[PDB]
């Protein structure tokens, strides 16, 4: 239903948010997950790091290279598991993988711009309260992701150079309210709420 689509991962579920974005995809829906470092997952932090732990040993013997590359970088990760669900190795694949970007933290050509959520893939509606969960945030750290604190600074920022976008969009829309009741009893505004509106 649009040309692009900026999701904000936060409060997500790799896993689920996971799909939807692969599905989409295969249906022409350029998507652009952000923020991510704040992903999420079923399971006590510990694991997963256990989980993680493996898809790590799995190598190639005979040349550790040319083998299954273990990215770290929240991003990448989400990615992957996204991916897995998009048949790449064909063309329609790929023509799929392009459509999708991904970053941890909302950079620019997006911090603008709006973002959304994916309900059906929000922790906070999948789980039941009490079950422990994760935070790709840690995870990534912990298996080595140099950069989590450099994001977590550029966050402190833009959570502002936003707010102060805000307390300014909001003192506006409010006058428009104390200058929108002078003119409306007007004639135009009673016929109106008969059709509706």
């Amino acid at each position: 239903v649009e040309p692009v689509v900026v999701i904000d991962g936060k409060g997500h579920l790799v896993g689920r948010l996971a799909s939807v974005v692969a599905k989409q995809l295969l249906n022409g829906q350029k998507i652009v997950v952000v923020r991510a470092e704040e992903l999420n997952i079923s399971g006590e932090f510990f694991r997963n790091k256990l989980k993680y732990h493996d898809f790590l040993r799995k190598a190639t013997a005979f040349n550790k290279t040319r083998g299954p590359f273990h990215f770290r970088a929240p991003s990448r990760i989400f990615y992957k598991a996204l991916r897995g669900m998009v048949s790449h190795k064909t063309a329609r694949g790929k023509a799929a993988l392009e459509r999708l970007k991904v970053f941890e933290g909302i950079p620019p050509p997006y911090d603008k711009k709006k973002r959304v959520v994916v309900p059906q893939a929000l922790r906070v509606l999948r789980l039941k309260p009490g079950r422990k969960y994760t935070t790709l945030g840690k995870l990534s750290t912990s298996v080595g992701w140099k950069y989590e604190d450099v994001v977590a600074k550029l966050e402190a920022k833009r959570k502002v150079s936003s707010a102060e976008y805000y307390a300014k969009k909001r003192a506006f829309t409010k006058k428009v309210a104390s200058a929108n009741a002078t003119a409306a009893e007007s004639d135009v505004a009673k016929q109106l709420a008969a059709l509706g509106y």
Binding site: V1, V20, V117, V118, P119, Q120, V124, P129
Partner: protein
């Protein structure tokens, strides 16, 4: 099994020149249809008496209704599940509106907690309790209290679309 219907099935033991008027056996059944029923019927008599679908015959097969469906009753129920091993008896209690949940709900419960099936459960007897207290297991007694009230916390709402604009909420 499916959804049930109480049933009254009044078999015989085929008449003979010898023993005319061969005594009539009633059984309240908790089945899916009158094919069940006439089945679920003979299975139980070939355990108390010397008859079968042959030396027999089914006289009547009457759906029975609840009297007061509306009316929330407290059904104790008795049950003989087989297990994997031996066989066991039970006395579960199930707060419900009519028989024909008391047996449905039960079978789901005997499934989930004990991994039995319809195959392996005999619903010995069912009995609307009249007075509270004859009620004996805390997961009913929980609900028969002074002006009862509770919230439904963490309300999750159900959407159709894929995307949304707000980031929800679970107030109620």
């Amino acid at each position: 099994m499916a959804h049930f219907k109480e049933y009254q099935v009044i078999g015989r033991r085929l008449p003979t020149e010898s023993v005319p008027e061969p005594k009539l056996f009633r059984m309240r059944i908790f089945a899916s249809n009158e094919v069940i029923a006439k089945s679920r019927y003979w299975y139980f008599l070939q355990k108390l008496h010397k008859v079968k679908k042959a030396s027999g015959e089914i006289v009547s097969i009457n759906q029975i209704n609840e009297a007061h469906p509306t009316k929330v009753k407290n059904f104790g129920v008795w049950v003989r599940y087989d297990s994997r091993s031996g066989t066991h008896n039970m006395y579960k209690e199930i707060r419900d509106v009519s028989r024909v949940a008391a047996v449905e709900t039960l079978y789901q419960d005997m499934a989930a907690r004990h991994r039995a099936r319809f195959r392996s459960i005999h619903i010995l007897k069912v009995a609307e309790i009249e007075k509270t207290a004859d009620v004996k297991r805390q997961y009913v007694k929980q609900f028969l209290t002074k002006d009862l009230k509770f919230p439904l916390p963490h309300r999750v709402q159900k959407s159709t679309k894929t995307f949304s604009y707000k980031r929800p909420s679970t107030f109620y």
